[PDB]
Scaffold this active site. Sequence first.
Site, mmCIF file in Angstrom:
data_model
loop_
_atom_site.group_PDB
_atom_site.id
_atom_site.type_symbol
_atom_site.label_atom_id
_atom_site.label_comp_id
_atom_site.label_asym_id
_atom_site.label_seq_id
_atom_site.Cartn_x
_atom_site.Cartn_y
_atom_site.Cartn_z
ATOM 1 N N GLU A 11 -42.078 -29.868 16.193
ATOM 2 C CA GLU A 11 -40.751 -29.259 16.028
ATOM 3 C C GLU A 11 -40.865 -28.013 15.189
ATOM 4 O O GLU A 11 -40.590 -26.919 15.657
ATOM 5 C CB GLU A 11 -39.778 -30.199 15.350
ATOM 6 C CG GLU A 11 -39.874 -31.607 15.799
ATOM 7 C CD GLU A 11 -38.551 -32.283 15.723
ATOM 8 O OE1 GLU A 11 -37.933 -32.292 14.629
ATOM 9 O OE2 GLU A 11 -38.117 -32.799 16.775
ATOM 10 N N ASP A 20 -27.321 -23.766 10.414
ATOM 11 C CA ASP A 20 -27.244 -24.072 11.805
ATOM 12 C C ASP A 20 -26.076 -23.409 12.420
ATOM 13 O O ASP A 20 -25.045 -23.093 11.757
ATOM 14 C CB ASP A 20 -27.076 -25.536 12.014
ATOM 15 C CG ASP A 20 -26.239 -25.918 13.255
ATOM 16 O OD1 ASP A 20 -24.989 -25.866 13.199
ATOM 17 O OD2 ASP A 20 -26.836 -26.317 14.286
#
Length: 170
Positions: A11, A20
């Site tokens: 990841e 985010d």
Amino acid sequence: MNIFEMLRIDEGLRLKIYKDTEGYYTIGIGHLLGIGHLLTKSPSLNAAKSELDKAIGRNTNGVITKDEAEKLFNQDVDAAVRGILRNAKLKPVYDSLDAVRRAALINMVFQMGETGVAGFTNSLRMLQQKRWDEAAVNLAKSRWYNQTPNRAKRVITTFRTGTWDAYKNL
């Protein structure tokens, strides 16, 4: 090697706090910030870096290091183990899997959550019976294998061989 290098490749370790898209502050390996009193949004960058600062023990303005990112993963790694153990479907499987194969599991969990993994029913039924090869084969007839083939291949090699071969050079 370990799970941390594993996920790092699978990841990615972000060294700088990035808010985010949807609404949420992550860092290191998807370690969000704000989880607290059951409320998930941090309310800013500034409580963002403070919560972050405390974790760590220094004045990062929102930047840590890889080692730093590591002492959080393992912390999230254990955190996860805690959810599986509460999960009747995964737990029995997870108990039996050897460390390497555990990581392998933990890995899918980080990527799709306990339900997603809990959905690979007989694949799961296989690893518990230790029919590696078949579990493997079974795991690759999924949208997962298709959604993400490369990461899938590694994890499945890890599940099948219980060795760290797949990451030998990344």
